[PDB]
Design a protein around this motif. Structure first.
Motif, short mmCIF file in Angstrom:
data_model
loop_
_atom_site.label_atom_id
_atom_site.label_comp_id
_atom_site.label_asym_id
_atom_site.label_seq_id
_atom_site.Cartn_x
_atom_site.Cartn_y
_atom_site.Cartn_z
N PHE A 127 -7.80 5.33 6.53
CA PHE A 127 -7.79 4.78 7.86
C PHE A 127 -6.65 5.23 8.75
O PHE A 127 -5.51 5.35 8.30
N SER A 151 -0.78 -8.14 -0.85
CA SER A 151 -1.60 -8.81 0.20
C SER A 151 -3.03 -8.26 0.25
O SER A 151 -3.27 -7.09 0.00
N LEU A 152 -3.96 -9.15 0.58
CA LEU A 152 -5.37 -8.84 0.79
C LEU A 152 -5.62 -7.58 1.63
O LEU A 152 -6.38 -6.71 1.23
N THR A 153 -4.97 -7.48 2.79
CA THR A 153 -5.12 -6.32 3.68
C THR A 153 -4.88 -5.01 2.93
O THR A 153 -5.62 -4.05 3.10
N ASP A 154 -3.83 -4.99 2.12
CA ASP A 154 -3.43 -3.81 1.36
C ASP A 154 -4.33 -3.59 0.14
O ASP A 154 -4.75 -2.46 -0.14
N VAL A 185 -7.33 -4.33 -0.05
CA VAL A 185 -8.60 -3.82 0.46
C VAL A 185 -8.47 -2.32 0.69
O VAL A 185 -9.34 -1.55 0.29
N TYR A 186 -7.36 -1.89 1.30
CA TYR A 186 -7.18 -0.47 1.58
C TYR A 186 -6.98 0.34 0.31
O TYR A 186 -7.50 1.46 0.22
N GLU A 187 -6.25 -0.21 -0.67
CA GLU A 187 -6.12 0.43 -1.98
C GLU A 187 -7.50 0.72 -2.54
O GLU A 187 -7.75 1.83 -3.00
N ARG A 188 -8.38 -0.28 -2.51
CA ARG A 188 -9.75 -0.15 -3.05
C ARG A 188 -10.63 0.81 -2.25
O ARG A 188 -11.58 1.41 -2.78
N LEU A 189 -10.31 0.98 -0.98
CA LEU A 189 -11.00 1.96 -0.16
C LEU A 189 -10.55 3.37 -0.52
O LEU A 189 -11.36 4.30 -0.63
N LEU A 190 -9.24 3.52 -0.68
CA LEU A 190 -8.67 4.75 -1.14
C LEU A 190 -9.39 5.18 -2.42
O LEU A 190 -9.83 6.33 -2.56
N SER A 191 -9.57 4.24 -3.34
CA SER A 191 -10.27 4.54 -4.58
C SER A 191 -11.75 4.94 -4.38
O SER A 191 -12.40 5.42 -5.31
N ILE A 218 -11.78 6.78 1.05
CA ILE A 218 -11.87 6.35 2.44
C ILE A 218 -10.47 5.97 2.99
O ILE A 218 -9.76 5.14 2.43
N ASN A 244 -9.93 -4.26 12.30
CA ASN A 244 -9.64 -3.26 11.29
C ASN A 244 -9.84 -3.82 9.87
O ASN A 244 -10.50 -3.19 9.06
N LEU A 280 0.81 -1.22 0.00
CA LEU A 280 0.00 0.00 0.00
C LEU A 280 0.84 1.27 0.00
O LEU A 280 0.69 2.11 -0.87
N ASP A 295 -4.72 -15.30 -0.07
CA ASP A 295 -5.16 -13.93 -0.32
C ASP A 295 -5.92 -13.84 -1.65
O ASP A 295 -7.01 -13.27 -1.74
N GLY A 352 -5.51 3.41 11.77
CA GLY A 352 -5.84 2.14 12.40
C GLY A 352 -4.88 1.70 13.47
O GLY A 352 -5.09 0.65 14.11
N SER A 353 -3.82 2.48 13.67
CA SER A 353 -2.74 2.08 14.55
C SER A 353 -2.20 3.34 15.20
O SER A 353 -2.85 4.39 15.19
#
Lengths: 167, 167, 169, 167, 167, 167, 167, 169, 167, 167, 167, 167
Positions: free
Chosen positions: I17, I1-4, I6-12, I15, K28, G2, K4, I19-20
Motif C-alpha cells: 500500500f 496493532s490490528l492495522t499493522d 492486517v498489512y503484514e497479512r496483505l504483504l504475505s 499486496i 484505508n 509493521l 484489536d 496510503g499516505s
C-alpha cells in the motif's frame, strides 16, 4: 501586549471590535465595553466594527440587549464578514449609521427537550428582529437563512442590512 | 489584559459582573469587589450585572451575605442568563432595583454524611430566601425548582424575580 | 490582574483575605500583609475575612503569631467557611471583634520521630488556644474536633468562636 | 502579582523575608535585597523574617556574608521554622536584636574530591560561627546537629539562638 | 516580578550582578548594563557582584572588553563562588577595588578545526591577562588551572585575584 | 522492536554490546547478560563489543566484577570508542583476546565526605587494575589519565590495552 | 510494528539498510546487524541498501571497520541518496558488487583541542580510503569535497564509486 | 523489550535482581518473583543479586518476609552497592550463601502520630534482625548506622554482612 | 496493532500500500517491502494499491527504481487518489497491469544552488518518464501539471495513466 | 513488560495480588481474575496476597462479593500493609486460611443526599461484616476505625483478622 | 490491546467493522481488510457491521470501490447508526444480504475551485448510486438529503436501504 | 498488558465485562465480543458481568440489539452497580439467568432541535422494553427514573430486574 494596547486606545475613541465568534466570553467582554462607554459619556456615538462568523444566539441577544440599553447611538461596520449573529448585530445598528466596507460579505445562516423549547422561542425572536431591522418580511428572512444566502456590500445595502457603503 | 482593564474601569463606575458559573473563586472575587466598593463609598449604589448559569449554594450564599453586608443598595441586572444561584442573586438585589433586560432568561434549578447535613441546611435556606425575594410560597419555589421551570423576561416580572424590564 | 488588583486596592483599605487552604506560601503572603499593615499604621484595625478550609497547624500557627505580634486590633469575619485553622484564626481575632455572616459555617477538625514530636507540641498548643478563645474546656474541644462537629452562625456564637452575627454593617 | 507587590511594599519598610529553602537563587535574591537597603540607607535597621527549612550551606554563607558586609543593623525573626541555615541566619543577626515568635521552631541539622575539600572547610566554618553566635562550645554544636536537636522559643532563648521572645 | 524589580532598583545604585553561568545570553545582558551605566554617568563607579561558576571564554572576554571600555572604575566583589570566567572577571576589576567577602571561594579551571584555532588564541590571551591581573607568572596560571586549584578569600588575596577582604 | 530483536538474536550468538555511556542502568543490564550467558554455558566464549565514552567507575566496576565472575572467557572489541571505563573494560578482557578495530580510539580520562572517601578507594583500585591489564606502571597510568592521552588502534596495541588489531 | 517487521524479514534475506543519517545509535544497530549475519553464515553475501545524508565520520568509520571485519561479501546499493559517509560506505562495498540505482545521486561533502586532533587523523584516513575506493588521486577526492561535487548514477560509475548501474 | 527479556530469561535460571531504589513498586515486583520461583520449584535455590541504594524499610521488610516465606534457600550476592535496606536484604540471605564480589561496597544507614509509631516499631525490628544476621550487638549496629559506616567487600566479610567474597563463579 | 497485522497479512499475499504522503520514511518502508517480496519470490506478481496525495520526488524516484529493480511484474491500482508522485508511480506500473477503480481520481501537480540543480535534474527526469508512461508529449505533461489537471478513471484511461478500469 | 509477565505467570499458579489502592478499574481487574480462576478449576485454592491502602468501599464490596461467589477457598495474605478495605478483604478470607507475614501491618480506617443514603447503607454493612469476620462487636469495630487503630501481626492474630502468622 | 485482539479474531470469521467516522485512515484500513479477506478466499461471504456517523464522500467511495472489486458477497448490518456514507455503504450491500437491527437508525445528510469541481462530480455520483441501491428516483434521494431525513429500521426497509430486519 | 490478558483469557470462558460507562467505543467493543462468542459456538452461554454507571441510550440500544441477535442465552450479573443503561442491559438478560451479587446496586436514572425528536422516540422505546423486562407498567418506569430510584439486590430481585441473588 501590543494588541490589547491598541484596542484600549481605540476604546478611548469609543471604537469597539467584534472580531471573532460570538460566545459568552466575547459577549460579556463586549457588553462590558458598551456599558463602560455609555457610562463614560451618554451622548457620544459608539462605533462597533464587525468581522465575525457569528455564533451562539443567546450571546448575541445579550449583546443586542446591551446595544438597545445604551442611550447613545451605535454605528456598526461590516469589516470582512458578518455572518449569522454577526449579520444580526450589524443590522441592529442605529438606522442610518450602518456601514459595510466595500468588500465585506454579509452571510445568513439557519442557526434536552427543554433546550429545544428555549432555542425555538429565541430563534423566532431573532428572525422577528432581523425582519424589523432589514424591513424585509419575516418569510424572506426565514427562507434566506435556510438557503445560506450571502451578500456583497452592494447586495446587502439593497436588502436592508446597511445604509451606506463607504468608499 | 484588555478584558481586565475594562472590568477595572467598570469597577471605578461601581459596575460589577457575575459572568460565569458561581464557584469558590468567583465568589471570593465578587465579595472582594463588593467589600471594596462598600469601603470606597457606603453611599453610592453598586450595579451587579448577571449572566451566569450559577452553581454552588455555599458559594452563592457567600455572595449573598456580602450583598446584605454592604450598606449601599445593590442593583441587579439580568443581562443574559440568570439560572440557579444566578437567579437567586438576581432576586436578591435591593427592592425596587431588580432589572431584567428584554431577552434575558430566568431558570430555576434543583441544585460525606456531614456534607449531606450541611447541604440540606443551606438548600432549605435558599428556598426560604427565594420565596421571600419573590413573594411566592416556599412550596411553589420547591415544585418549580424540582421541574426546571424557566421564565422569559415577561414571565419573570410576574413571578417576582425582578421589578422592571428596562429598554 | 483584576483579581490581584482588587486585593491590592483592598489592602490599602486595611482589609485582607484568607480565601483558601492555609499552606506555607499562603501563610507567608498573609503574615507579610499583617506585617505590612502593622508597619504602615500601628493603631488602625485590620479586617481579616476568612473563607477557608484551614490547613497545616504550623502555617496556621505562624499567621497567629503574626496576629499577636501586630499592635493593632485584627477584626475577623467568617465569610463562607471557617474550618480547621480557618476556624482557629477566626476565633483568634481581637475579643469583641470576631464576626459571622449569617450563613457562614464553622467546622472543627482533628488537624520522622522528630516531626511527630514537633506536631504533638504544636497540636497541643492549638487545642489549648482554641479553648482560651471559646471559653470551652479542652475536653469539649478535643471531642468536638474528633467528631468533626460543625456549626451554623447561631451555634458558633453560642460556642464562642465569634462575638456577633452581623447582617447589615 | 499580588504576592510580589506586597513584598516590594514590605521592602520599602526595610522588611525582608526568607520564606523557603535556601538555594543559590534565593540567596542571590536576598543578598540583593540587603545591598539595596544598605545602599538606600546605611544607618537604619533591616528586618529579616525567617520561616524556612534552610538548605545550601554556601548559599547561606553568602547571605551571611552580605549581612556582615551591610553597615546597618540587621534584626532577625523566627516566624515559623528556622531550620539548618535558617537557624544559622537567625542566630547570625545583630546581637540584642534576635527574636522568636512564641510558636517558632528552631531546628539544628547536619548540613568530587575537591567538592569534599570545599564542603569540609565551609562546614567547619559554620559550626564555628554557630558556636560564636550562640555562646555554646563548638563540640556542643556538632553533637546537637548530629542528633537533630530542635527547640521551642523558650529553649532557643536559653540556648542562645535568640535574645527575645516577642508577643 | 519582585526579583527583577530589585535588580533594576540596584542598577539605579550602579550595582550590578553576575550571579549565574557566563554565556552569550548573560554576557549581553551584562555588557548592556555596563554600557547603560557608563552612559548615565561616566565618572561614577560601577559595582559588580560576582557569584558564578564562570563558563564561556568568548562570553567572558566580551564582558571584560566592555569593562575596559567603560570610562569609570569597576569595583568587583567575590560573593559566592568566582569560578573560571567568574574568577577572571573578578581579577579584572579596577586595581585597588577588587574585594572578596570572607567566605567567598575562587576557583581556577582549564576553561571545526577553525573552532579549535580560535579557541587556542582566546585561551592564550585569557592566561596572559590572568597573569597580568594577579601578578603571577603565566606558567603558574596554567599549572594552577590544570590542577583545579581553589582558594579561600585569604588565599585569593595572597595570590592576587583581589585587593581586599571585607568584614 | 527491531533493535531489541537484533541485540537479542546476537545474545543467542553470545555477543554483547556496550554502546553508550556506563551508568547504573547499563551496568545492571550488562551484568545481567553476562550472568545469563555464563548461566547458559559456563565454558563458551563471550564476545563483548565496545563503543562507549565510559562513565561511572562504580558502575564500570560492577561490570568488571561480573566479567571476572563469569567462568567462561570474555573477548573484547574496541569498535569505535573505548574511553575511560570503556577503555578499562576493554583492557579487562581475557588476555590474548582483547581486540581493536583499525579505526578504534582508546581515550584515557581521569574520571558527601563518605562519598569522596569511597570514590578515592575505587579510583586507586581502578588505576592499579589498569596497570595490571596493560603491564604499564601505576605512575604512567595516572600521568596519562591526567593529560587525557588518546590512542590509535596501533598506539593502543603497543601500550597494552589490546592484544590484536583485527582485519 | 509493521516497519520493524519488514526490516526483520529482510534481515533474514540478508538484506540491511542505511536509510537515515549516520550517527552513533544508527552505527551501533548497523554494526550489530552485520555482526549477526556474519555470525549466522560467514559464506553468504549481505546486501546493504543505502539512502542516507551520511553523518559522523567516527560512526561511518565504525560501520566501515565492521564491514571489513565481516568475512562475507557486502554488496552495496545506492538507493536514493548516498551523501558523505553514505557515499563512503557505498564505495566501500566489495569491488565488483557496488551498485547504483538509475536515479541514485551521490554527493561528496567535506565532513576540545583533543577533539580537533582526533578529527584530523580520521578525516585524513577517510580521504585516503575514498581515494583507494574509487581509484582516484587523494588530491581530487579532497578538492571535490571542498566544492560539494555531486554525481548522477552515470557520473558515479565513471568516477569509481560503483561498479554497476542496475536496471 | 530486550532488558525485560533477559531478566525473564534470567528468572528461568532462578536468578533475580535488586538493582534500584527499594520502594513499594520494586518490592511488589520482587516479592512476586520470589513467590513465583517458590511456587515453581520449592526445593531449589533462588539467587538474588543486589546492586541497590536501598530506601523504604516497610518495602524492604516486605521483601524480607517473602524471603522468609519461601521454602527454598535464597543466596544473596552484593554485586555493586548494597546500602541501607540493600544491605539488610543482603545480610538476610541463607547463612553460608551470602556473597560479596571483590569490589562490592556495603553501606549502613539510619533509615501522623500513628505513622511515627509504626515507623518506630519496624525500625527496631530492622536493627534487631540486622544484629542477628551479622552477629553484632544491637548497640554497634545502631552506632554504625548513625555514623553511615561503609565497607569494602573484605571489611564486610569481617563484620558479618556476607559469608564469602566470590571471585570466579 | 490490528492495522499493522492486517498489512503484514496483505504483504504475505503480495499486496502493498501507498496510503499516505511520500516522505522518505514511507519510501524506505515501501522499497523494503518490494525488496522483500522480490527476494521471497521473483516470479509472482506484486499488487500495489495507491491512495496517496503524492509527495517527494526523490522518494518517488527511489520507489520507481525499486519497482524497476524487482524482476516480478508490479500491478498498480488507483484506489482513491493518485496525485503527483502517487500518479507517477501508478503510471509506472507494468504495462497491461495498471488499473484504476471506478471512482479513483488521478491528479497532476508541479512536484542551496546545488540542491536546485539536483531538483531540476530529478524534475526533468520525472516529466520524461511520465511522458513515456502515458504516451503524451513532455509539453502536454508539463502544461497539464502547471494547471493541476485532474482526471476521472475514464479520463485517466483516455490519457494513458492506466490500462484498465476495474469492476 | 516483565512485571505483567510475572503476574500473568503467577496467575497460572493461582496467585493474585491486591498491590495498590482499591478503585473501580483495579476492583474490576481483581474480580475478573477471581472469576477466571474460579472458572478454571472450581475446587483448587486461590491465594490472594495483599499490600494495599484499601480505598473505595463499593469497590471493596464488589471484590468481596466475587470472593463469596467463587466456589473455591480463597486464602488471604497480609504482605505489607492491609488497610481499610485491604484489611477487610484480608479479614474476609476463608476462615482458617487468613495469614499475616511477621512484619505486616493491619490498619482500620473510617471509610447527593442520595449519595449519603447509599453510603450509610454500605458502611453499616461493611462494619457488620468486619465484626463477623474478626469476632469483635460491631461497636468495637467502629471505635477502633474511628481512631485509626493499627495492629502488628501478633496484635492482628489476637484481634481476629487472621488465623496464622507465617514464618 | 484486547480490542484489536477481538477485531482480528473476528476477521477470521470474515466479520469486519466500520465503527466510527469514515475518514481516509479508516477507509484505508477497511479497504485493506476487504482486500485481505478476498485474497484469503474469494468464494465465501464478508459480513460488514456498520455503526457510523459517516463522513468523507470520497473515502466512502474508496471503500465502496473495494466492495464492488471483491468477488465475494458482502453482507451489511445496520448495527446502530448508519448516517451519511454510513447509510450509503450499508445500502451498497449485496442485494438480499442487507440487514438492519431492530433499533438501528439510518440518516441521510447532504454531505479550491478544483476541490469544488471534484466534490460536485462525486456528490452527483453518490446520489446516483443511492438511487440505484434503493430503487428510489434520484430526485427523492436529493430532496430527502437536503432536509436530513432519518429512518427507523422499518422506515428503512420501506425506502430500500436494507432487505431484512433481523431479530 | 495483564489487564488485557485476563479479559482475553476470560473470553475463552465466555465471560464478558461491562465495567465502565456505556459509550460508542465500549458499545462496539462489546458487540464485537458478543458477535465473536456467538460465531464461535451458537448454543454455549454468554455471561455478561455488569459494573457500569450506564451511559448513552443509543449505544446501550446497540448492545441490546446484539444481545437479542446473539442466538445463545446471555446471563447477566450485577457486579457492583448497574445504573442507567447498566440497569437496562442487566434487566435485558435471558429470563431466569439475570443475577445480582448481594451488595450490588441497581440505579434507575433519567437518561437542529431534531435531535430531540430522535432522542424522544428512543427514550420511549427504552422505557417500553425496560417495562417489559421487569413487569412494571410504563408509567412506573418514568416516575421512578425521574426521582432516581435506587435498589438493593433484594429490592431489585422483587422489582424485576434480576431473577436470582447469588451467595
Amino acid at each position: 501586549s501590543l494588541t490589547d494596547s491598541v484596542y484600549e486606545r481605540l476604546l478611548s475613541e469609543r471604537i469597539i471590535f467584534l472580531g471573532s465568534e460570538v460566545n459568552d466570553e466575547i459577549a460579556n467582554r463586549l457588553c462590558a465595553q458598551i456599558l463602560l462607554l455609555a457610562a463614560e459619556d451618554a451622548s457620544k456615538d459608539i462605533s462597533l466594527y464587525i468581522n465575525s462568523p457569528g455564533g451562539s444566539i443567546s450571546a448575541g441577544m445579550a449583546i443586542y440587549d446591551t446595544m438597545v440599553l445604551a442611550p447613545c447611538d451605535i454605528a456598526t461596520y461590516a469589516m470582512g464578514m458578518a455572518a449569522s449573529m454577526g449579520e444580526f448585530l450589524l443590522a441592529a445598528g442605529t438606522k442610518g449609521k450602518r456601514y459595510a466596507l466595500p468588500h465585506a460579505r454579509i452571510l445568513m445562516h439557519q442557526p434536552i427537550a427543554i433546550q429545544a423549547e428555549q432555542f425555538a422561542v429565541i430563534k423566532k425572536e431573532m428572525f422577528r428582529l432581523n425582519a424589523e431591522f432589514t424591513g424585509q418580511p419575516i418569510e424572506r428572512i426565514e427562507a434566506d437563512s435556510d438557503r445560506d444566502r450571502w451578500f456583497t456590500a452592494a447586495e446587502a445595502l439593497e436588502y436592508g442590512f446597511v445604509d451606506h457603503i463607504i468608499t
